[PDB]
Amino acid sequence: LIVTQTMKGLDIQKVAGTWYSLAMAASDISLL
Amino acid sequence: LIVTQTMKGLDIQKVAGTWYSLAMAASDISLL
Amino acid sequence: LIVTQTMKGLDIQKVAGTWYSLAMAASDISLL
Amino acid sequence: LIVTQTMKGLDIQKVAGTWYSLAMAASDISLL
Amino acid sequence: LIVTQTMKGLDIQKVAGTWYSLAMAASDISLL
Amino acid sequence: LIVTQTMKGLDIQKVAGTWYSLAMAASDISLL
């Protein structure tokens, strides 16, 4: 399993809330 | 399994809520 | 399992909340 | 400039010669 | 400039010669 | 300039010659 996530030139503002993570990756990801 | 996710030149604002993650990838992803 | 996450040129402001982590990665990630 | 080159499951033998490089990438590449 | 080169599961034998490098990357690469 | 080169599970034998380097990377690489 190979994962390649690149982000370039982003503009994030006024993110009031529960910002988890812009980018995430794993072998098994589940949200209960 | 090969995953290639690239993001360039994004503009995000006024994201009040539960922003999880702009980009995510895994072997098995499930949402209960 | 290989993970490569690169971020270049980001602008984050006004992030009042529970900012967890811009980028995260593991073998098994779950949110209860 | 973003470059993502992944190679998986290769079989190379009997390569007598001037093997330069299986995969290469740069901003400006020229061969004189 | 972002470069991501991953190689997994390779089999190289009988490479008599001038093996330079399986994978290479730079800002400016030229061969005279 | 960001370079990420990962190699996993390789098998190299009978490499009589001038093996330079499996993986290499720099700002400016030239071969005269």
Side-chain angles (χ1 to χ4, degrees):
Chain A
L1 186 137
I2 294 151
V3 177
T4 294
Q5 318 176 347
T6 57
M7 276 80 71
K8 186 200 306 186
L10 280 76
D11 207 280
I12 293 92
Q13 293 177 335
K14 305 212 185 272
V15 175
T18 300
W19 179 354
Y20 261 48
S21 178
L22 188 147
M24 292 177 72
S27 202
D28 288 276
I29 186 167
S30 295
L31 295 174
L32 271 40
Chain B
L1 186 137
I2 294 151
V3 177
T4 295
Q5 318 176 347
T6 57
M7 276 80 71
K8 186 200 306 186
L10 280 76
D11 207 280
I12 293 92
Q13 293 177 335
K14 305 212 185 272
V15 175
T18 300
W19 179 354
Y20 261 48
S21 178
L22 188 147
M24 292 177 72
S27 202
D28 288 276
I29 186 167
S30 295
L31 295 174
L32 271 40
Chain C
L1 186 137
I2 294 151
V3 177
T4 295
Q5 318 176 347
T6 57
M7 276 80 71
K8 186 200 306 186
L10 280 76
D11 207 280
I12 293 91
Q13 293 177 335
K14 305 212 185 272
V15 175
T18 300
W19 179 354
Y20 261 48
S21 178
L22 188 147
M24 292 177 72
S27 202
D28 288 276
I29 186 167
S30 295
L31 295 174
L32 271 40
Chain D
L1 186 137
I2 294 151
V3 177
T4 295
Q5 318 176 347
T6 57
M7 276 80 71
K8 186 200 306 186
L10 280 76
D11 207 280
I12 293 91
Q13 293 177 335
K14 305 212 185 272
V15 175
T18 300
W19 179 354
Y20 261 48
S21 178
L22 188 147
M24 292 177 72
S27 202
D28 288 276
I29 186 167
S30 295
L31 295 174
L32 271 40
Chain E
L1 186 137
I2 294 151
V3 177
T4 294
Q5 318 176 347
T6 57
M7 276 80 71
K8 186 200 306 186
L10 280 76
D11 207 280
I12 293 92
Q13 293 177 335
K14 305 212 185 272
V15 175
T18 300
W19 179 354
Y20 261 48
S21 178
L22 188 147
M24 292 177 72
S27 202
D28 288 276
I29 186 167
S30 295
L31 295 174
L32 271 40
Chain F
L1 186 137
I2 294 151
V3 177
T4 294
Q5 318 176 347
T6 57
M7 276 80 71
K8 186 200 306 186
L10 280 76
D11 207 280
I12 293 91
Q13 293 177 335
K14 305 212 185 272
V15 175
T18 300
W19 179 354
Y20 261 48
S21 178
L22 188 147
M24 292 177 72
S27 202
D28 288 276
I29 186 167
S30 295
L31 295 174
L32 271 40

